[PDB]
Amino acid sequence: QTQQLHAAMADTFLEHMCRLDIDSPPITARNTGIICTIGPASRSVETLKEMIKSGMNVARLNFSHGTHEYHAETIKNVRTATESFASDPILYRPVAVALDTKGPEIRTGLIKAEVELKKGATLKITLDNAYMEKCDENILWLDYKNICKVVEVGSKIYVDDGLISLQVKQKGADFLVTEVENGGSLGSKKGVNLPGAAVDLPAVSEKDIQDLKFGVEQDVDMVFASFIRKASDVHEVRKVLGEKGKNIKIISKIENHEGVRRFDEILEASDGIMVARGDLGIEIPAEKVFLAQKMMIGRCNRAGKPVICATQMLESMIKKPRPTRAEGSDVANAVLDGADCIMLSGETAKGDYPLEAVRMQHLIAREAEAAIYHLQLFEELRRLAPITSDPTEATAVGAVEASFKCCSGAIIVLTKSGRSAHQVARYRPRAPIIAVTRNPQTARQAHLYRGIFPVLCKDPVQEAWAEDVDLRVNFAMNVGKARGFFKKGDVVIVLTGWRPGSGFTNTMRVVPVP
Amino acid sequence: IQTQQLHAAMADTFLEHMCRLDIDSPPITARNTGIICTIGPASRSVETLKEMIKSGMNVARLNFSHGTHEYHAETIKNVRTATESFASDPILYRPVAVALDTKGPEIRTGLIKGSGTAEVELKKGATLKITLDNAYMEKCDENILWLDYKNICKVVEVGSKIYVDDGLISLQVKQKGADFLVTEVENGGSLGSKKGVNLPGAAVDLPAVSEKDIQDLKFGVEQDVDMVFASFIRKASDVHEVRKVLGEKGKNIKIISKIENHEGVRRFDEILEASDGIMVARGDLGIEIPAEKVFLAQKMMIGRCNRAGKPVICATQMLESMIKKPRPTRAEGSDVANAVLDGADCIMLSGETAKGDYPLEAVRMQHLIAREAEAAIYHLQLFEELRRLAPITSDPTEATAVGAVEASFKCCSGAIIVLTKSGRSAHQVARYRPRAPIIAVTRNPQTARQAHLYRGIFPVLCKDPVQEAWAEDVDLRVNFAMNVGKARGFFKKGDVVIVLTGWRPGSGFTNTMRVVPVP
Amino acid sequence: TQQLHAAMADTFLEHMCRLDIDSPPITARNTGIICTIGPASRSVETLKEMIKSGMNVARLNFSHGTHEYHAETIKNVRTATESFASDPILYRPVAVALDTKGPEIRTGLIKGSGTAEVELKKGATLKITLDNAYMEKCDENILWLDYKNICKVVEVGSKIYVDDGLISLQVKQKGADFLVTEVENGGSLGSKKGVNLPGAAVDLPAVSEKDIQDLKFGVEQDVDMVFASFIRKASDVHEVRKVLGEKGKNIKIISKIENHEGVRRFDEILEASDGIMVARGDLGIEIPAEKVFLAQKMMIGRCNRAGKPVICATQMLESMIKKPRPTRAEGSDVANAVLDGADCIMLSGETAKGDYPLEAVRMQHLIAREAEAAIYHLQLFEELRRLAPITSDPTEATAVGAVEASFKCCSGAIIVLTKSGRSAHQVARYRPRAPIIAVTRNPQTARQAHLYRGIFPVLCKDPVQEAWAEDVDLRVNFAMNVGKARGFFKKGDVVIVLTGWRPGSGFTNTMRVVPVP
Numbered sequence A: 001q002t003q004q005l006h007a008a009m010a011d012t013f014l015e016h017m018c019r020l021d022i023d024s025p026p027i028t029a030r031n032t033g034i035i036c037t038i039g040p041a042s043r044s045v046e047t048l049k050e051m052i053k054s055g056m057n058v059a060r061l062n063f064s065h066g067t068h069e070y071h072a073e074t075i076k077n078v079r080t081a082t083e084s085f086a087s088d089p090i091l092y093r094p095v096a097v098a099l100d101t102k103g104p105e106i107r108t109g110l111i112k113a114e115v116e117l118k119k120g121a122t123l124k125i126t127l128d129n130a131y132m133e134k135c136d137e138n139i140l141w142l143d144y145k146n147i148c149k150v151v152e153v154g155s156k157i158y159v160d161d162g163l164i165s166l167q168v169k170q171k172g173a174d175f176l177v178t179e180v181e182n183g184g185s186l187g188s189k190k191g192v193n194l195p196g197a198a199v200d201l202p203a204v205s206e207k208d209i210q211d212l213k214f215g216v217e218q219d220v221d222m223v224f225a226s227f228i229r230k231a232s233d234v235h236e237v238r239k240v241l242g243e244k245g246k247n248i249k250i251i252s253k254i255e256n257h258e259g260v261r262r263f264d265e266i267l268e269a270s271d272g273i274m275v276a277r278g279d280l281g282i283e284i285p286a287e288k289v290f291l292a293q294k295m296m297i298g299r300c301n302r303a304g305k306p307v308i309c310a311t312q313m314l315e316s317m318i319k320k321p322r323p324t325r326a327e328g329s330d331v332a333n334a335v336l337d338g339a340d341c342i343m344l345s346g347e348t349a350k351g352d353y354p355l356e357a358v359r360m361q362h363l364i365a366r367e368a369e370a371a372i373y374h375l376q377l378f379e380e381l382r383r384l385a386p387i388t389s390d391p392t393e394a395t396a397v398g399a400v401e402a403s404f405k406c407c408s409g410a411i412i413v414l415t416k417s418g419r420s421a422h423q424v425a426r427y428r429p430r431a432p433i434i435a436v437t438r439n440p441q442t443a444r445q446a447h448l449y450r451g452i453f454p455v456l457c458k459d460p461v462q463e464a465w466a467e468d469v470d471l472r473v474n475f476a477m478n479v480g481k482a483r484g485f486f487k488k489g490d491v492v493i494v495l496t497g498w499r500p501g502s503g504f505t506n507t508m509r510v511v512p513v514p
Numbered sequence B: 001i002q003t004q005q006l007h008a009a010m011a012d013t014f015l016e017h018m019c020r021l022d023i024d025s026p027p028i029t030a031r032n033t034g035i036i037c038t039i040g041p042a043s044r045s046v047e048t049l050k051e052m053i054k055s056g057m058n059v060a061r062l063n064f065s066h067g068t069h070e071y072h073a074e075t076i077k078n079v080r081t082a083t084e085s086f087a088s089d090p091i092l093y094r095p096v097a098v099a100l101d102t103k104g105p106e107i108r109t110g111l112i113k114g115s116g117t118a119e120v121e122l123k124k125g126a127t128l129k130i131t132l133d134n135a136y137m138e139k140c141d142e143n144i145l146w147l148d149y150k151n152i153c154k155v156v157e158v159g160s161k162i163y164v165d166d167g168l169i170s171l172q173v174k175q176k177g178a179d180f181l182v183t184e185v186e187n188g189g190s191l192g193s194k195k196g197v198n199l200p201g202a203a204v205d206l207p208a209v210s211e212k213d214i215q216d217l218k219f220g221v222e223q224d225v226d227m228v229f230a231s232f233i234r235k236a237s238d239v240h241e242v243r244k245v246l247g248e249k250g251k252n253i254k255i256i257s258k259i260e261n262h263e264g265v266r267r268f269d270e271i272l273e274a275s276d277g278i279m280v281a282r283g284d285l286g287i288e289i290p291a292e293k294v295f296l297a298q299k300m301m302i303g304r305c306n307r308a309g310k311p312v313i314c315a316t317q318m319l320e321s322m323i324k325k326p327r328p329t330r331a332e333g334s335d336v337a338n339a340v341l342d343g344a345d346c347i348m349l350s351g352e353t354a355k356g357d358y359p360l361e362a363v364r365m366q367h368l369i370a371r372e373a374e375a376a377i378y379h380l381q382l383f384e385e386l387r388r389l390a391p392i393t394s395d396p397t398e399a400t401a402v403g404a405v406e407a408s409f410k411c412c413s414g415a416i417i418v419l420t421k422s423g424r425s426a427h428q429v430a431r432y433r434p435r436a437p438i439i440a441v442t443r444n445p446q447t448a449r450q451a452h453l454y455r456g457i458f459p460v461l462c463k464d465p466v467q468e469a470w471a472e473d474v475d476l477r478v479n480f481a482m483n484v485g486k487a488r489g490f491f492k493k494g495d496v497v498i499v500l501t502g503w504r505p506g507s508g509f510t511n512t513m514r515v516v517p518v519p
Numbered sequence C: 001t002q003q004l005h006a007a008m009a010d011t012f013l014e015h016m017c018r019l020d021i022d023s024p025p026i027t028a029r030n031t032g033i034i035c036t037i038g039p040a041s042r043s044v045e046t047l048k049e050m051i052k053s054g055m056n057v058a059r060l061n062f063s064h065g066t067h068e069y070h071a072e073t074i075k076n077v078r079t080a081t082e083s084f085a086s087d088p089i090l091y092r093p094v095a096v097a098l099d100t101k102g103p104e105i106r107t108g109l110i111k112g113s114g115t116a117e118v119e120l121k122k123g124a125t126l127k128i129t130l131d132n133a134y135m136e137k138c139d140e141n142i143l144w145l146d147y148k149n150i151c152k153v154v155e156v157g158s159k160i161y162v163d164d165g166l167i168s169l170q171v172k173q174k175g176a177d178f179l180v181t182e183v184e185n186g187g188s189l190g191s192k193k194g195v196n197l198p199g200a201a202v203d204l205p206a207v208s209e210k211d212i213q214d215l216k217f218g219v220e221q222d223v224d225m226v227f228a229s230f231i232r233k234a235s236d237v238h239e240v241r242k243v244l245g246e247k248g249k250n251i252k253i254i255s256k257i258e259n260h261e262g263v264r265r266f267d268e269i270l271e272a273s274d275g276i277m278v279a280r281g282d283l284g285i286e287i288p289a290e291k292v293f294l295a296q297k298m299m300i301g302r303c304n305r306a307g308k309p310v311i312c313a314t315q316m317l318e319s320m321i322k323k324p325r326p327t328r329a330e331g332s333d334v335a336n337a338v339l340d341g342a343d344c345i346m347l348s349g350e351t352a353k354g355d356y357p358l359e360a361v362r363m364q365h366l367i368a369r370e371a372e373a374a375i376y377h378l379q380l381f382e383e384l385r386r387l388a389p390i391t392s393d394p395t396e397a398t399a400v401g402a403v404e405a406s407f408k409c410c411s412g413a414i415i416v417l418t419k420s421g422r423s424a425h426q427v428a429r430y431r432p433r434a435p436i437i438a439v440t441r442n443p444q445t446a447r448q449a450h451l452y453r454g455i456f457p458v459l460c461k462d463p464v465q466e467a468w469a470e471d472v473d474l475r476v477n478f479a480m481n482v483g484k485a486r487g488f489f490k491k492g493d494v495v496i497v498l499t500g501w502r503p504g505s506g507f508t509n510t511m512r513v514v515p516v517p
């Protein structure tokens, strides 16, 4: 009668659906990470404190706009807010900083200011920089020098986040003649999309380069790399991060058809993925976005790599204290699909109800996690699981199976790098995975993985290693008792390794909570 | 292989199925999920209604929370005029149903400053007196708000939360009174006229069927509506009341019960048993229960309806942003697709079509998403589970239905063609959720219109006179269906289709499945 | 009844747990029974009783007997079968199968006698000779064999197995036209016993001179199928097909798999054949006996997946040669063959030579009937469907539809009108629980139908009615009358009927769900 446990026992998915129960309350623990974009609505230390209390796990900084000075201050504010809770390490929640790059863009020039484009009219594009400052009703300059190479007669060109739609009729040397499909107001310096085109713009812009160096300087936890189209774009980002940035997680943002097409190579080269639905729905028909989303979430779950669902999840909450019914549904279905994290953009950056937006994602996620059909999900994740000789992988699956057999309150995992805990998360237990680490960055980065509740042990290192291990297990028991995940006498699963250092998790214990 | 998500269709696991979903895999022409559009000022002209039918509208919903009988009579006439403008060629005629959505036990606010269009914008932390003094029913403003629920005090209690306008404005009761409440604006916004008011956690003792509802149901009978969407159904006796009010004259009208509150969810099984179908009325629902639990209730009701073989509609805010914008949000794309994947027979538009700036674009977008989502269903497991979950019965029509759907998967058939007088034989096929469209050929125009409630049914109304020889009459209808599919691009000459008929005239005798190539 | 409680289990494990010895089966037995005819079972009198007890196919073994002897056996089987033809409701078609000798190797005669035996002691010496002067003077010192090439294919260390693999020899000196061996497994050595050489590459023809004569004899006697011995590869099968010629083109070739090479090359052999016999006697000598069940299950599964008949053969009810009841291992084996998915089960010595031939047939009947009810059709049908291509063939669509409908209403039968049998075969391949009553006017189609699990062929002999709808109705009523009389169903039960939209072969597209009148 709690946790949708009745629905969880159903022999079929249809009967599982029929058993879902609005009167079956969820556990306390919410497994899906919440990523909040920070902006004018959410930037103060006092608001950030409430965001953390409301459930923010990751603070996202959008580098499309704003100076390094500004973002540095934002990051400082985030850290001040986070560390205000530091004094009680049992209740302290790590908060990660994510840098989302501007990435390469196609832009128009200066009009004549705005101008009107009428449905059916003719409209030349030129790369002749003499028209850079002189765009108008008959003529439009663009900054992408190689556009004629990458688009054909009959192709479509979108301008100003998709408001405007053109069709290429003539394809010359340094020019294109087009008819205006979707007319409207044409401003200056607008963004241009090219659906279906293989855009050959660099993997990282001049500004992205400076921006990633700033990320390393500022000790960010992860980078959301914009407009990733191929594996080699991920490598160029990785090479720019370099030795100083080598522990920074690269999450690839899939934003166009080519990125969807070449998804498998991108996934293999990345630490995780963001389904950037905003830009993706400009580039592919909006009715196909759910397909791409479900496909990418499935493949990420199969590979055991974090996937973030992004953009317009609770959009109406920019203006309103409650979301639309479509928005509640979108969030629940992203969690049911398998998304590791869900994200807020305008809802937390600019909106009037940023705390309400964060609270709603937390509430829905928690209800949605209880409603997953773990019986089939776990069987399927096993079957598609390769048989290998890696001891930590066998221990992980063993722990998750044990956790289902005894409905443990948690799986406690000692981890330095986070990997042991990620290997458990990939099998999607129902039980929260309390990842105990002394590495503050690991604690921050753990949020990317569904089910991981990171805790940062600050206790001094004991001289006897077995005692230092027992010290950290007990810390995890105290965190669980305090947050109400379980109580004395409940059963939990504990994972440790055979020696200090990373790579040696091979020990699973089923233990009473002291 | 590379159309209709057939690579995904063949996956041995649901996880692998998801992994194979392909944006470059184009759907078939036929869209199975019915689209219900609310008609109002933006869409009630004949001219616009014609374009709604071309864009995909199957049912025209009339919302009796507003408007006079004269107003709704004319909307209905316009719907029929637009629908019959296509009747000259019976092969391309699309039937359109008329649905009456009852007002039911509502609480509504009054007019702002005596105007239905006037608004005040309110601020958080203000004071607002509510009143039942009918002297203020058209003098609602920043300070005084009139409500039509005469028993408001009861029920209500101090500290209770009162919600106005689709839950967007929130008031908290600081003090009770004889016929007045005193409140603080917990959440601000622009307050308008005749807005819906909710009292979650209060026992609203308003009748199941008010005198206005009785007036409206009588009108629906007189106007020959196809279905009634009954508001705020709480228990089986509510459904029986509507059925007895409709009486003999309304005995063929379908009753769709709207589940809009906590008691309706709890008592869902007896409501379903009593009803002809269900609407998941998410607007009120997500105010009466926590918004975060609406998806649970939605998926439970779609599941139980699918298991019962009764139609279920998912309603409210599916493409809400399209009221002001030509393109929906990504959440709205997802919401429509996920309703279809859940198993919803029909999807609905309200303000998007009733009063928005882009009613045609909203109908088109629902058509497009529905069709993409229908190809993405994991039929392999779905059909296995519907088969397993259905009892082993002696009913010959039920055996033929499952046989037909099985055969339709085996040959990836262009259609399942079903002859039906009442619709039932076509409903029995729809229940097993074939990929193929079901072409239901009838001579009963009501059956034609009502069959849109069922996933996958494309009703076609045969106009040809009855032939003296019954076998020739049957064959005439089968060929009409052949002609319709080909004109619509469902299939071409030499494609294989499944054909369902009976062994004698009249309802209840469907027992014959034939697998026939398209001539 | 019919283990229907077990049938509804959501798991194979729970299905087993629900099997119930107090749940009686239906009357219908879907698994064909093939009986080997010999002196125990050859008279018309005894063949009539065999038919009553459930024989569907009479196998003649051409390892022994003259063309004159076998023609007489065939006449007796045909006389036996046609004695029931006075009552069309009760007539059962019985097929005739010819089983070739193939490239066998045989020893000679112990001391000039067909019954004499000698004792071979473990470790004692035995000289094998090809000197035809010892052809009828075999004893414990010298044994003659009829494979003249045995010396150019075995090597010192080689093993040679004699008499159903009960006696084992090891070559300790290889000669010119001789071998010297030491007896590993001793015992009683008799005359004209079978010899095998596992690991040896035997140089004998796929189809010998005598084999050719026998296959031509088959064509002339109008047999229904041929069981072709020791098929090692596809080209062996094409050789049998070639001898059968255009005149015997409708005769079913069942490839008998009896050695390692046959198993290894199974897929090419199955694609060439009309069916398969798991010939377990020779197979369990050519390969280790403990591996035979693997081969049996691989072969039954591959045949079920290809939709081709498969027969399980040899030693199924062995002890019943001397005893009126079987061992527990034999009850288990017949049942498990049926659960594996064998279309037919066979008897050899049990019916040919043994003391209790009617009891062996009756036992196979009783066991098969219980085991068919114990099949987990829920998973079987689901796998067969999934492992089935999406096709444009209307008859296939109709067939899978009819099987689905038969499960939905637990139909008393699926009735199928068929000229060539193909339509009924297409239904059988999806393994319905309901019996498939195949109504044909073609006597060969009715006889060959017995090779497919589930098919109960009935031969309609009434003249073709001018009105086609009435001719179809006539046959459907005939199938209803047969089923009633046999207790497959009663008035008020529901049956599935499959027909075409016109007369002639290849038009099956119509399924109807009808009450039994």
Ligand SMILES: Cn1c2cc([S@@](C)=O)sc2c2cnn(Cc3cccc(N)c3)c(=O)c21
Pocket (backbone or CB within 6 Å): A013, A014, A336, A337, A338, A372, A373, A374, A376, A377, A380, B014, B015, B341, B377, B378, B379, B381, B382, B383, B385
């Ligand atoms: C949503 N869904 C569906 C739908 C169908 S068809 C009968 O409409 S079967 C099925 C199904 C099975 N399992 N799970 C859990 C699961 C399994 C594999 C991957 C994920 N993400 C989630 C599911 O989530 C799940």
Ligand SMILES: Cn1c2cc([S@@](C)=O)sc2c2cnn(Cc3cccc(N)c3)c(=O)c21
Pocket (backbone or CB within 6 Å): C012, C013, C016, C339, C375, C376, C377, C379, C380, C381, C383
């Ligand atoms: C023998 N068998 C069968 C047969 C069928 S139907 C197509 O004739 S499905 C199936 C099946 C499935 N699993 N296993 C392994 C198993 C599972 C559960 C209990 C036992 N003893 C053995 C089986 O052993 C097993």
Ligand SMILES: O=P(O)(O)OC[C@H]1O[C@](O)(COP(=O)(O)O)[C@@H](O)[C@@H]1O
Pocket (backbone or CB within 6 Å): A414, A415, A416, A417, A418, A419, A420, A421, A468, A495, A496, A497, A498, A499, A500, A501, A502, A503, A504, A505
């Ligand atoms: O998840 P990682 O990075 O592999 O770390 C897991 C490691 O943590 C431990 O449990 C504890 O190690 P430490 O004492 O070095 O922190 C090791 O036995 C184990 O290998």
Ligand SMILES: O=P(O)(O)OC[C@H]1O[C@](O)(COP(=O)(O)O)[C@@H](O)[C@@H]1O
Pocket (backbone or CB within 6 Å): B419, B420, B421, B422, B423, B424, B425, B426, B500, B501, B502, B503, B504, B505, B506, B507, B508, B509, B510
């Ligand atoms: O779905 P329903 O209402 O039972 O109608 C199906 C009926 O239609 C038919 O196929 C044709 O009947 P009619 O000629 O009376 O229209 C009957 O054979 C069958 O019983």
Ligand SMILES: O=P(O)(O)OC[C@H]1O[C@](O)(COP(=O)(O)O)[C@@H](O)[C@@H]1O
Pocket (backbone or CB within 6 Å): C417, C418, C419, C420, C421, C422, C423, C424, C471, C498, C499, C500, C501, C502, C503, C504, C505, C506, C507, C508
């Ligand atoms: O299995 P086959 O050889 O295709 O025979 C099936 C045929 O039998 C029938 O049901 C009846 O045919 P007949 O009237 O010629 O016997 C046909 O309609 C159908 O095509």
